[PDB]
DNA sequence: TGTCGTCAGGATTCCAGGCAGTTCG
DNA sequence: CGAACTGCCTGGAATCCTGACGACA
């Protein structure tokens, strides 16, 4: 097997590089935020052999209640916010209650909900022919934070109005930048398997140097100063027993070193962003601080290679760029009807209007309990990144830019046995100033036909 | 390979086997013409054991060819459990891979145990200055560690010019053990510069459980340097321990 | 055969190690038991089954509720962190007793995952730690 | 209020610590310029302990303002569990509600514990008729309460002009501890008229558990009156107990 | 229903207490 | 001649080790 350490091509001299000031500043850093004095200090008062799981997962929802509750307080629309335990004092007046969604019960009379807060639990009944019945029905059923306006009854809270953590439609626009800059969003590379679209990848690397086919690509590529990788750089180890006969590179150091030789072709003026994943030799539990210190030694050696956290909010030119991968899309298309993998953006709208990444538990990804919920989108996100479905779609929701990143491997038998058609060689060229999709690059000609 | 060695006393060596068994679980005492040594680490990565016992400690010392054998700490620990120091410890190994432990005391007890094939990787230890070497007794370490380990789990070692202190903090229970040269528990100080470091007292508990009362204990460590603690046996033998510092809070 | 057949694997495997002349090649015999431990720890990890003291057959939802609404007992969770830690040193000592490739990622990924989940900088890799020793080989070679 | 207390012989005081913490887990120290007293009550309302320590017991004893402090003896037991006798125990309090225990001697060990409030029922020591006074020892009390425990769960006190006997029987086994002047168990006695009462065993077994064997104990009781178990410390201090009588026998 | 956590009884060691061998007041 | 110095034997306090009881899915 090869090691990908031979592809060394210098950039084309005919391609003009623009020398300009490149600001860079990350906002969500797991080192200074959580693990500084909150993650190592959870309880410190227990037996000789105690657990730190009851408190982390206990406060994990309390932090979400404080953050999302603060978001509801920032919105000048929700009013009369009370606790569930305070509903016994109010006789008939309608109030707002904020709580978790335990389950969802469907009945001919209407929708019976089980809302539990840190103070109490009550059943929130809402009619079927309601205006907010669609939002409350299509919402995330296992875990969600909701608010209701209504009055309690004989033990069942008869709510009238629904409130979800949706982004505000009314938002202040961003000032126009003096210099134009673009960005590329890509993930699901999966280096290490025998079905990798190596051709589209090397033509893509050669395309990054300035070897463009059309004249329009020169103006955009000449101003690209940032590259972002979502995750899933390898095929994974330990998923299915028939993977050893498929992994072309069974050595993990050759995958990290191979990936390092494949990524070193990017010029130095382009800022690199490397985010960890769940298939690589790193922390498979979300959230993910970064890579390990054994296998990521050549990556740490490269100063240009920046190992960002997962998730990470990268603020560029005053823009909040939420970088994450998640698995909420599959939970939506598998749990909410009328949703499929062919339209992943539609599944991403539900995740956008909840300010969370992956609230559904039980899917094929471990969730690590933390005393502070970090997956809550506090500030107004300008970009929402996701994937794991290999279908790229463009959709803007309430001025928020929604797009996918695609993949770089051909369709496998595993992908064939689950009835999902991947879309490899999808390179979306987005704009940083306008925070919208600028161009779409499709190298599907070099890949397999879907 | 066959060799025989007669060491007088059984309890003094049983303290070494007790300290080793409480600090390591699998070790293979390597036998050289200079004496019995063992450079190994606990399989849980907590301490680092280095036993150096010259032939001067042993009464009779007869070697044919230097070789290495493996000894279980548990079984050999149970042998010298009730072994009186007034006996005569005898180690004999012949052609076969058996160990003969003859006791010539109030009752001759010729013993036999198999010797397993330990695959211990002989690893050495590098050399570098620590700038903090102290000479303290053993009992002061006993009462100083067994009392602070109940209020906290990590202890902080700080040594200055003619000053020694070991303070440990916690939620609502602080402690410190300050000693100087004019005290009665600190023998000597070779501190040259300011030294401060943090370690885990939970390792120091079992690490010092096997120490004596009048045994001179020498500690060598640094700021970011690991912890070293060595002490002599019958004024000639040397037992050195080295543990990595705590990278946590 | 957790008693006789397990020791039989521990002795026959060592006989095979003596037979291959310290030349170990990657295999799936114990890995045949290590894969269910990996998918069981990762699977039950995100489950976190809450069972109160009084009620046993009454399981609580994966979200946190604070206390059991039915019974006045604390809720006990099963993230599979303390039950699988017993079978890990069984094969971990054997895997640690040899330097082999293509398997270090599976051995160290789970224990480092437990470390990252729960949370002693070792002076050096003397516990047979292929991490520092190996990366040092590659770094010094570059 | 800041104050300085210096007491020698922490080993003798540890028995008082075990005796005092064996019943109640927390203690309320009345810190007075004339001395340190302590009135703590058992939660089951069975015994009242009062420690009286004058100023003359403490060599170095500085009082700024008398007050009441709260000591969690559950950890103070661990403080004085390893305390020696030839050392010097020091209890100093500063401005904050913390207690700093300077332990000087062969090694310097200072402690820092919080001072929390102690909830105890206000029960004084009324001037009650005590017509039975006997002087016992620790071994006499240990053997008496333990041997009386192996036979029953209660005890019957019968004291006459020149005798002090304890008869107790559950159903079959009978115990009768007689004290005379020919032996050494009974040194002094003050019983004017014959007196009888009844008390428990488990509580007396819990109070004698901290008290040693060579410790003379003064016992007082009257006809169906509460028991007053007091004894001097260094011939100046006085520890007084209060037991509740039992209706059974 | 097996297995893990925890408490009381027995065994162990150093120090106090008590007992041999010798010499000068 | 007889107790102190020196050295040594034994019980008591602190410590360590082990068996039995109560709880959980
Ligand atoms: Fe992918
Ligand atoms: Zn993915
Ligand atoms: Zn319950």
Numbering used by the authors:
A (entry chain A): 286 to 735
B (entry chain E), D (entry chain C): 1 to 249
C (entry chain B): 1080 to 1198, 1206 to 1228
What does the paper say about this structure?
PolD is the archaea-specific DNA polymerase that functions as the replicase in most of the organisms in Archaea except for Crenarchaeota. The PolD holoenzyme consists of two subunits, DP1 and DP2, which contain the catalytic sites of the 3′–5′ exonuclease and the 5′–3′ DNA polymerase, respectively. PCNA is the sliding clamp that enables high processivity of DNA polymerases and thus is an essential factor for replication. We obtained two structures, Form A and Form B, for the PolD-PCNA-DNA complex.
The DNA in Form B was bound to DP2 in a substantially different manner from that in Form A, and the orientation of the DNA bound to DP2 differs by 40° between the two forms. This swing motion appears to pull the growing end of the DNA out of the polymerase active site. Moreover, the nascent chain in Form B is unwound by five bases from the 3′-terminus. These results suggest that Form B corresponds to a state distinct from the synthesis mode and thus an editing mode. On the other hand, the DNA orientation is toward DP1, and the 3′-terminus of the DNA can reach the active center of the exonuclease in Form B, although the 3′-terminus was not observed in the EM structure. In the Form B complex, another contact was observed between PCNA and the central domain of DP2, due to the tilt of PolD. Intriguingly, the third glutamate, E171 of the PCNA trimer, not used in Form A, was involved in this PolD-PCNA contact. In contrast, PolD is substantially tilted on the PCNA in the Form B complex, and one of the three PCNA subunits is available to accept other factors. Therefore, exposure of one of the PCNA subunits in Form B appears advantageous for recruitment of additional PCNA-binding proteins to perform functions different from DNA synthesis.
